[PDB]
Structures are given as structure tokens and as C-alpha cells.
Nucleic acid binder design. Sequence first.
DNA 1: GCCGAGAGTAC
DNA 2: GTACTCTCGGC
Length: 54
Amino acid sequence: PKAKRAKHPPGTEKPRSRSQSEQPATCPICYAVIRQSRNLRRHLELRHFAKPGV
DNA sequence: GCCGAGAGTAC
DNA sequence: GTACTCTCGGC
Ligand SMILES: [Zn+2]
């Protein structure tokens, strides 16, 4: 239905207002270093809570 | 296989 | 006016 989020279209400016808002992030389980805090949550499901939630 | 980053929107 | 989430490609 809605178009997908493609970063291919022209006029793709890279403002720091998207990276500046996030601060470095470390994993308390395997000390993995994730830069974006949002990505840190994803790391939890990838190398830790990646098991069935049931 | 994981990682890193852009856009659209709400308050 | 900021940060939020969802997505896509790259090595
Ligand atoms: Zn970890």
C-alpha cells in the first residue's frame, strides 16, 4: 500500500539532528558497543533475547 | 550474519 | 523544536 522507505531518492541530506540525538551505548551482558541507543535494544533481541518469547 | 544510518510523526 | 520508531543497504 504505502511506498517503502528508500534512501535512494535524490536530496538525501545527512543532518546530525538524527545522530546527535543518540549517544553511545554499551550492552550490560556482553559489553557489545552499540552507538545508537535504539540499536542497543535491537542488540538485546539479536545476541540475548533472540529466543522465543513463549 | 551483524552493524550503522535516513525518513515520517507526535507532543 | 527534539527525539521517537521503522526501514534499507553494506562489509
Ligand atoms: Zn550483548
